[PDB]
Amino acid sequence: VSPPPPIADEPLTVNTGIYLIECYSLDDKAETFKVNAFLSLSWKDRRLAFDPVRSGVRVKTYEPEAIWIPEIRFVNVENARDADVVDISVSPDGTVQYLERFSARVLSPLDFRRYPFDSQTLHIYLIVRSVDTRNIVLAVDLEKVGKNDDVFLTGWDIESFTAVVKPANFALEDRLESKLDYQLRISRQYFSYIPNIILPMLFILFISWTAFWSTSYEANVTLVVSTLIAHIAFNILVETNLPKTPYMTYTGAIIFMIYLFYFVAVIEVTVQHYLKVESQPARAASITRASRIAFPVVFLLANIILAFLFFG
Amino acid sequence: VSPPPPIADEPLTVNTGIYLIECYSLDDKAETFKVNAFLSLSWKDRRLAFDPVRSGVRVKTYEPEAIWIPEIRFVNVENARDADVVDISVSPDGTVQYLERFSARVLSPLDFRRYPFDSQTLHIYLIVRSVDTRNIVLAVDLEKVGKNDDVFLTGWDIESFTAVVKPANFALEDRLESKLDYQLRISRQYFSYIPNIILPMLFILFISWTAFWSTSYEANVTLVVSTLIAHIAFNILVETNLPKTPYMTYTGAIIFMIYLFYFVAVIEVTVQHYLKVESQPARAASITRASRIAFPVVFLLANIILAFLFFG
Amino acid sequence: VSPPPPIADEPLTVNTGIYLIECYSLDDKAETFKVNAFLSLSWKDRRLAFDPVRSGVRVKTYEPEAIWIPEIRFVNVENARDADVVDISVSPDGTVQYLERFSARVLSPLDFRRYPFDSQTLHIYLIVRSVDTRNIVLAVDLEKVGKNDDVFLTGWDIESFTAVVKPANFALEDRLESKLDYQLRISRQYFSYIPNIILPMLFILFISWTAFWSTSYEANVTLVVSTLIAHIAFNILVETNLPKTPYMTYTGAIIFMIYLFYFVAVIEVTVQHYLKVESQPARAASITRASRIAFPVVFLLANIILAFLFFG
Amino acid sequence: VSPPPPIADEPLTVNTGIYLIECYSLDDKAETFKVNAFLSLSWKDRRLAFDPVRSGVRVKTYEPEAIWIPEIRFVNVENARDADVVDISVSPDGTVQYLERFSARVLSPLDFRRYPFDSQTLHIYLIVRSVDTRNIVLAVDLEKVGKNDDVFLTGWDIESFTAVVKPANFALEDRLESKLDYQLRISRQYFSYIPNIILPMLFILFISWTAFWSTSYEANVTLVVSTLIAHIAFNILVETNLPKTPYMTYTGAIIFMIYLFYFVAVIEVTVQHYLKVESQPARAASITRASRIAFPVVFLLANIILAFLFFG
Amino acid sequence: VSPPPPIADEPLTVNTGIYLIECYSLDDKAETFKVNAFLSLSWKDRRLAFDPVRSGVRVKTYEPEAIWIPEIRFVNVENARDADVVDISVSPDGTVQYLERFSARVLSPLDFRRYPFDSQTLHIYLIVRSVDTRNIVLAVDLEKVGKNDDVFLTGWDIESFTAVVKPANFALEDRLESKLDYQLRISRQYFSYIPNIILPMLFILFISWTAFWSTSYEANVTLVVSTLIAHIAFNILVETNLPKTPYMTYTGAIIFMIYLFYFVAVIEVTVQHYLKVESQPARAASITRASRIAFPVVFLLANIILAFLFFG
Ligand SMILES: [Cl-]
Ligand SMILES: [Cl-]
Ligand SMILES: [Cl-]
Ligand SMILES: [Cl-]
Ligand SMILES: [Cl-]
């Protein structure tokens, strides 16, 4: 109803704390996730002080109305959180303990430069706006920050959930505001990617390469082109789940490299057939024997160079 | 309006019970499901006692306001439940009878190690938070727990719906809480999977294997590569549904084994043609004669070993 | 405000009636549909009887509040209905007339044993709970049950919309309840399935069979395997719509039969080539000539037997 | 608060009008579209009359409450419209002006007998129910019916938006009601369907037909079968957008014709090879030469006949 | 709740300014996007002026009630905005400062004529409605127009965010109306489209063109038709992330030209074989060696013509 008047000019400090209960629905393309947690607040209000002995009580309980509650808002949320007050209590000296449970949908960008083996950081921002009569700043209560042991994300491993103690103060629309940053660090579970994507791709590439041990043109054409079709199908399957980015990723580089290898293999088969038709089997044999060793070695070297370039 | 005052120090016991009406929309990828049921509560409040003869009635009826109702919440839910009050009744001694119908969406992890033939357990958690003046604990009323005869889940057989009668008491946010566990056990209906997935795969594999009775290189290449493409399409269709897990499952192992078999078949065809083109037909005949028996036997042994290793 | 007291022991009867306006969005996979209709209720209340001559009116109008209105609920709904009251009228003798318009989503199982040519029956259940002082039952008013001539479902034909007059009375949660059943009978529009699915599949099967008039092994292999791939694509397209069931259907049986036929055709082609290579070009000719007649006759007999089994 | 009393028996007249602002999301399969428009009403209430000279004003503004506003509903909507009141004004003689902005989702059937080149009419129905003391009818005010110049429908051309002047008075649920019809006429933009769907299909068909200038059986088999597979893929793509209908459309007829043509082409290739193997080259040459001319002419004639049938 | 006093004859001017916070969910299918931003207002009221020394205060803080605030809405929104008032303050003069936060779903047309390399402009329209007693106009405050540094859209770059100073005044529904225009210029990030789309397509086309260096008819048929199948599959891959619009875009022209080139290549191969089978090798050799040069040059010239036509 009315913010507590200051003594002389001191600001009002509000202690915050978030306790995660459930987190779920991490969408890569939409770059969002949903959360379910507690919100804890604590400040000072001398007007509500009382004598414990006179009143015969040690804790008083107030309804959300008929009491001043600061307005805390999340910055990067799609809609205002749906919340419900759990409990409000007042201490004899004037300290107020506030608790509520909410749910919200949070927007946060993701970095996909190492997509199969990447780690991400998700941010939650709290802000408060100063009133025309009092200045309000935020702080962090280290005891009230935490998460449940049952919190799970489908496909991710949760590492930590901390908060930066120092807030950021800035002027927005001729008023002063304070901001807090809560960080949740997660890592991707990449085990399922190996036997479901990587190994079949290598098998198909080897089946394509086995055409350097034959001399029949039609069989070579069939092998190479059909393996190319299989590669296109796998590429569609993989790309349906990876969002478009303005930079170069590991997976895209590997896929482009495989396309280039298929093109060069077709070129080699055509060259060998053309040489053999003109009655020059010696050059064709030399080229084929050279390619048999040239292709895997260059593939391995290029893969090693790419790994050093993206993880070094 | 105010919790009942204790006689001397005793905690308040609230008897609960859930009666299922509808359960539906089990999402394997999101690991969620939707529920629709009754919620029953009963506690003791001596402030509402009355004299039957003086009043002339047997049971009174109050509105949800101007009466104290304990705050019960679900832990693993996406949002607060949609509630409505059905009936409130008070006995002459003071016992209160409460009834309510709700609906919610519940989060619960799943285990996919035996995906076609797996059985799951779904959990619902009830919690109550103690007030600053009284201690509250939960209890189970066995005569109020059950389900309808028409409760059906598309694709699952429902086996039982019970509750663990021992609650868990702990501290959180400087208060004591009590939690209850309700367990629903289901089994997947695996009949449709056999003639839709398992047998076409075997027929395609046998069609691929029929290439050990031939000597034409082009026909063998066409057979094997076309069957491989069909296998890839089937694998994509299967994987569209099953999610990604940090552990190996039965279906993934089988699919990887089939990929390995196709690779070895291509190698065998290439080796046979290479040996024949060098005017060594006896060795090629010996190798293909061995392969005709070697492939199905090793396949059968591999599936027997995998089935023992995953289900025993 | 309070249920009307009885005379001695008579129960309270409520006359119901549902008039369909819009029914739409029948999902086969979820087995749900959406409805929009009118709900009519009528009962007796002697506490509201008035003298028409004194009042000067033939009918009195009341608000939804300030008058006791029984609570009627739908059993098989995902959420509570969204309703708005249209009018309330009271006759001088005390009979109360009620009206409202609602919209809800109804859960109802379906049977797919004859999927292309099946018929269904959708159920809507109405229930009422007895108050402690009065016992309430339900009755059907045949003069207020019907549907608009413009009620249309996409892909279905509507036959009738009736109600079962006899209510089912039982006990639930220490109270007596009455239940009514409204049945909507529909049939499927199967014309679009024939030229879109059935005929192309037969054409592809005949194209596959055309290989019994040829002796070129490579051409036969190409024909049979490519037609198998086309069959797989069509099967995936069909399977995207029909959900999984714990029993066998007509379409699944036909698809499995086609897979078996393709396998046998591949075996026959391989056998003919093998016998020709061994320099016995008479048994191969006999087998091919036999198969030319054997395949269509067996296909026709099997289709007749399956059609008799599923629709007889 | 109460319907105005008549002079002797005349019905109350309400004048309506709809001004379109937005129209979007026209779903072919669901047969729904979304709207955003102003709603205008005007009636007569003599009890609100005042003398402007004594009052000192020319227009009096009333809150939506404490005044009688007629209940107007939309018949073919999924849910009740979401609206807010804009302005209410009363003329000195008693005439009331009312304005409101709403949004709704409408249901309307569609016709697909000429799917690429079809024209549709969308209906919006307004209804009102008579009260027990007064009779209400609806009229049309042509000065308040129209649409914005920024109204755009993705894929359609908006032609006109009018209202049928004569309402439909009928008795429903023992009460007389009046209904109005608003019609919006749209036409489909078919240009993008030509180069994206139509011409590639012709190119693939001609590629299939080019096999009448060769005598190599394997090449002809490969050509025809692979082009059939490509046709199947397009057909799936095209079908994934057009809903199933209980009648026959133009596109389905063309697609079935293409399937028939592929079947007959395969038959011709088989016949030619069989005749050539039997040392009868003259008949095979004559048949191939005849087919070279026969196929395109019959295709063109069938297309002309179908176009005449579906557009004449 | 009183409109500000009109001093002689003058309209009321309101200074508006929108400060962006979040932008997300830009759907090209429905041409919609969600926004989250501030809204600043400022106008004048004679009565609210108060003496500073008499009160010993600088600025007051009025509730939404007991004060008059102009109603301002957005033309292009599916539903009304969800707003919560943040701060209302009054200077020592009659000037009032108003602030609020809102979220909305905006409808704005999109253009994809240059789809990969296109730029779009998003519009937000602010409108105030005049009352029967006072005229209202809208102004623009440049110090309140801004955009956060953390505003991001998935796959787009944000160029600028300004407003058009000049309103548009027009009469609608017998009332004078004023409008404002806020424009947000964006451009699409096209880097990822080169290695994902452009280069694989070129590789496939070159693989198809490699058939001008061979004589084997079967190999040429296999190459060209299988590359056509790969082209159709990659068309599916491209179309999976392209809005379904009735447009004549750059991509559609490219794909149609590719289809034409495939058709002409098939025609050339057929002509070469047909000439060769009649013992005219010189003409076939000449045609092949001419096509080797003709195809790429014509392809490049057509590409240049299309690029100059669409981007000129
Ligand atoms: Cl918030
Ligand atoms: Cl809850
Ligand atoms: Cl209900
Ligand atoms: Cl409505
Ligand atoms: Cl708004």
Q: Which of D162, D82, D152 is nearest to D122 (CA)?
A: D162
Q: How many angstroms separate the alpha carbon of residue A76 from the centre of ligand 5?
A: 21
Q: Which of D57, D68, D60 is nearest to D87 (CA)?
A: D60
Q: How many angstroms separate the alpha carbon of residue B80 from the centre of ligand 2?
A: 4
Cα distance between residue B188 and residue C246, in whole Å: 10
Which of chain C's residues have a Cβ under 8 Å away from the Cβ of B186? Answer: none
Find all residues with CB under 8 Å of E269, minimum gap 6, and list them: E211, E217, E220, E221, E224
Is the CB of residue B233 less than 8 Å from the CB of residue C232? Answer: yes
Amino acid identity of residue B103, one-letter, is S
Beta strand C119-129 pairing with A119-129? unpaired
Tokens of C123: 């159920």
In chain A, the N- to C-terminal Cα span, in Å, equals 58
Cα distance between residue D144 and residue D39, in whole Å: 9
- Given 1.10.10.10, 2.115.10.20, 1.20.58.390, 3.40.50.720, which CATH number is that of E193-310? 1.20.58.390
Is the CB of residue C289 less than 8 Å from the CB of residue C280? Answer: no
Best residue of B65, B228, B238 to probe chain A, by most A CBs closer than 10 Å = B228
Q: Closest Cα of chain E to A117: distance in Å?
A: 20
Which burial class, exposed, middle or buried, applies to E86 when counting CB atoms under 10 A from its CB (0-12, 13-18, 19+)?
middle
Handedness of CA A134, A140, A143, A148 (dihedral sign): positive
Q: Which of D245, A77, A145 is nearest to E103 (CA)?
A: A77
D:159-218 residues touching chain E, CB 8 A cutoff: 189-192, 195-196, 199-200, 203-204, 206-207, 210, 213-216, 218
Task: Report domain extents, chain C.
Answer: 12-188, 193-311
Q: Which of A277, A186, D294, B233 is nearest to C235 (CA)?
A: B233
Q: Within 13 A of E103's CA, how many CA atoms are on the CB side?
A: 12
Beta strand ranges found along chain A (DSSP E): 12-27, 32-44, 60-61, 72-74, 82-90, 95-107, 119-129, 136-140, 146-147, 156-163, 168-171, 176-188
B:32-61 residues touching chain A, CB 8 A cutoff: none
Tokens of D41: 């009403």
Cα distance between residue D8 and residue D11, in whole Å: 9
With residue C291 as reference, give the H or E element that holds it: helix C283-311
Across the B:C interface, residue pairs with CB atoms under 8 Å apart total 106
Find all residues with CB under 8 Å of C62, minimum gap 6, and list them: C88, C90
Cα distance between residue C41 and residue C14, in whole Å: 6
Partners for D (CB, 8 Å, 3+ pairs)? C, E
Pick the ligand that lies closest to the CA of residue B21. 3
Beta strand C82-90 pairing with C60-61? antiparallel
Q: Does C27 touch chain B (CB under 8 A)?
A: no
Nearest CA in chain A to B269: A210
Cα distance between residue D239 and residue D243, in whole Å: 8
Alpha helices of C189-249 — where are they, by DSSP H? 193, 199-209, 217-239
Give helix D217-239 / helix D199-209 axis angle, nearest 10°: 160
Tokens of D103: 């949004």
Cα distance between residue D229 and residue E260, in whole Å: 19
Beta strand B156-171 pairing with B176-188? antiparallel
Is the CB of residue C217 less than 8 Å from the CB of residue C81? Answer: no
DSSP three-state, residue C105: strand
Q: Which of B118, B120, B104, B139 is nearest to B186 (CA)?
A: B120
Residue whose pair of structure tokens reads 């694998």 in the numeric block: B235
Q: What are phi and psi of D32, to 5 degrees?
A: -135, 160
Give helix B217-239 / helix A199-209 axis angle, nearest 10°: 170
Pick the ligand that lies closest to the CA of residue E82. 5
Q: Which of E15, E5, E17, E11 is nearest to E94 (CA)?
A: E5
Beta strand C72-74 pairing with C32-44? unpaired
Looking at CATH, the fold of the domain delimited by C12-188 is given as: Acetylcholine Binding Protein; Chain: A, (2.70.170)
Nearest CA in chain C to D263: C203
Cα distance between residue E267 and residue E264, in whole Å: 5
How many CB atoms sit inside 10 A of residue A5's CB? 9
Is the CB of residue A209 less than 8 Å from the CB of residue A224? Answer: no
| CA B58 centroid distance within chain | 46
Q: What are phi and psi of E248, to 5 degrees?
A: -115, 85
Q: Within 13 A of E110's CA, how many CA atoms are on the CB side?
A: 24
CATH number of C193-311: 1.20.58.390
Experimental structure resolution, Å? 3.2
Nearest residue, CB atoms, D213 vs list E30, E225, E274: E274
> What's the length of chain E?
312
Nearest residue, CB atoms, C154 vs list D31, D78, D274: D31
Is the CB of residue E124 less than 8 Å from the CB of residue E106? Answer: yes
Helix, strand, coil shares of chain A as percentages rounded to 5? 35, 30, 30
Which burial class, exposed, middle or buried, applies to D308 when counting CB atoms under 10 A from its CB (0-12, 13-18, 19+)?
exposed
Is the CB of residue C157 less than 8 Å from the CB of residue C33? Answer: no
Q: Residue C92 to residues A10, C13, D74, D209: CA-CA distances in angstroms?
A: 72, 19, 33, 85
Cα distance between residue D72 and residue D63, in whole Å: 18
What residues sit around ligand 2, an ion, with C-beta below 5 angstroms?
Answer: B 73-74, 80-81
Contact yes or no for D222 and C227 at CB 8 A? no
Q: Using what technique was this structure determined?
A: cryo-EM
Pick the ligand that lies closest to the CA of residue C72. 3
Cα distance between residue B168 and residue B128, in whole Å: 11
Longest Cα pair distance anywhere in chain C, in angstroms?
115
Tokens of B229: 């493409």
